[PDB]
Amino acid sequence: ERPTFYRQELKTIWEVPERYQNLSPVGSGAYGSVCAAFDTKTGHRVAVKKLSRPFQSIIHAKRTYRELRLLKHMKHENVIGLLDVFTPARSLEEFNDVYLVTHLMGADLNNIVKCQKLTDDHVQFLIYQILRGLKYIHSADIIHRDLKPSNLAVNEDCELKILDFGVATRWYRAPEIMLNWMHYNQTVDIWSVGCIMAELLTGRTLFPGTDHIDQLKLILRLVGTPGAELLKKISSESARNYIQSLAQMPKMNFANVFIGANPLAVDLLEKMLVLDSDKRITAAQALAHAYFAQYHDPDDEPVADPYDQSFESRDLLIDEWKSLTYDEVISFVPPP
Numbered sequence: 001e002r003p004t005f006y007r008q009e010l011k012t013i014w015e016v017p018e019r020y021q022n023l024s025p026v027g028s029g030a031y032g033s034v035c036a037a038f039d040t041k042t043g044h045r046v047a048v049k050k051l052s053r054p055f056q057s058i059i060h061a062k063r064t065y066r067e068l069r070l071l072k073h074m075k076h077e078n079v080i081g082l083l084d085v086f087t088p089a090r091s092l093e094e095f096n097d098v099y100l101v102t103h104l105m106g107a108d109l110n111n112i113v114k115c116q117k118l119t120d121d122h123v124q125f126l127i128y129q130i131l132r133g134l135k136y137i138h139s140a141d142i143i144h145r146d147l148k149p150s151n152l153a154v155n156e157d158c159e160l161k162i163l164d165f166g167v168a169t170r171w172y173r174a175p176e177i178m179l180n181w182m183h184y185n186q187t188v189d190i191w192s193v194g195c196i197m198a199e200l201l202t203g204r205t206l207f208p209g210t211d212h213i214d215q216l217k218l219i220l221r222l223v224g225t226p227g228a229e230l231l232k233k234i235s236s237e238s239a240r241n242y243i244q245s246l247a248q249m250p251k252m253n254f255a256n257v258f259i260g261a262n263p264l265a266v267d268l269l270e271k272m273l274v275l276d277s278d279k280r281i282t283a284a285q286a287l288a289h290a291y292f293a294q295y296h297d298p299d300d301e302p303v304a305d306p307y308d309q310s311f312e313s314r315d316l317l318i319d320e321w322k323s324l325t326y327d328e329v330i331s332f333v334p335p336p
């Protein structure tokens with residue numbers, strides 16, 4: 001039974017089920033067209049995102065479908081999930097707007113740290129949750145690709161979720177992406193986690209580059225010029241020359257960069273900030289690292305159901321993407 005909707009303005013107009021009350025814009029553009037609301041069904045505050053021009057073009061329609069598919073798939077404590085999705089339309093013919101309802105978080109990870117060191121216990125808890133969510137995301141063959149403190153949100157009980165509010169900042173970007181090395185694996189996200197973890201411990205950005213070149217120079221000063229093993233995997237002579245032109249010395253010992261830090265934290269940072277992404281620790285491996293002994297539970301670090309992203313390879317018409325999106329709205333099943 002279709003609930004009754006009500007309209008509102010909010011310089012953006014919102015038609016939502018009566019279920020959602022007390023709507024108010026939040027983030028003022030940083031979050032998009034997002035309002036906080038009171039979910040009368042559960043008595044919890046929620047976030048309502050209205051999609052912008054979802055079916056204006058093939059690209060818009062496919063992006064709308066993609067985001068709905070991703071959100072419908074993510075069912076994990078440390079990843080943003082879909083509480084509801086709705087449209088005022090009563091038919092595919094009238095279908096032109098999509099609203100996504102998620103949990104409302106309280107702050108991102110810039111708001112928690114505020115340029116001050118966190119305790120080592122608190123860093124364990126925060127990074128453990130990030131890695132727990134990444135193990136889940138990566139098990140579905142999904143790569144975040146833009147992990148950074150602003151895409152990590154917490155509530156008052158310090159419970160953390162991974163989202164994507166999106167390039168804005170390069171401070172957390174893996175060197176292989178910056179170098180256009182083309183073959184990326186999931187540990188580009190592990191690089192970002194390493195940068196975040198270092199920042200939580202020290203209160204300082206690990207690699208605060210002024211521009212693209214400076215960012216790579218700062219990275220390579222810490223992690224060193226490519227070793228012989230990594231150089232063997234670089235096809236292009238110009239590519240080999242270019243990376244060496246930005247570097248010089250071997251890597252530094254992280255034990256003499258993170259003075260006063262838990263030696264287990266330093267060991268983990270070493271394994272996350274490896275230049276060769278083939279040698280970089282995975283999320284599942286990192287969760288078993290002794291640094292997380294007080295939080296690690298091998299039986300509550302779940303993986304995702306298989307995620308069918310064969311649609312990514314397809315060239316469909318605008319009405320086909322729209323119909324596929326409409327079918328995914330209809331088939332949605334709320335959580336418990």
Ligand SMILES: Nc1c(C(=O)NCc2ccc(C(=O)N[C@@H](CCC3CCCCC3)C(=O)N3CCNCC3)cc2)cnn1-c1ccccc1
Nearest residue numbers: 031034047049067070102103104105106107162163164166
């Ligand atoms: N602003 C918000 C919200 C909110 O916007 N919720 C709506 C809300 C919808 C959607 C998303 C979201 O992340 N959507 C992803 C798909 C899921 C991703 C989860 C991780 C792994 C990779 C996939 C996506 O496809 N796109 C399209 C391209 N650009 C980026 C987003 C976030 C959020 C929820 N809480 N808060 C909040 C309030 C105060 C302080 C801090 C946060």
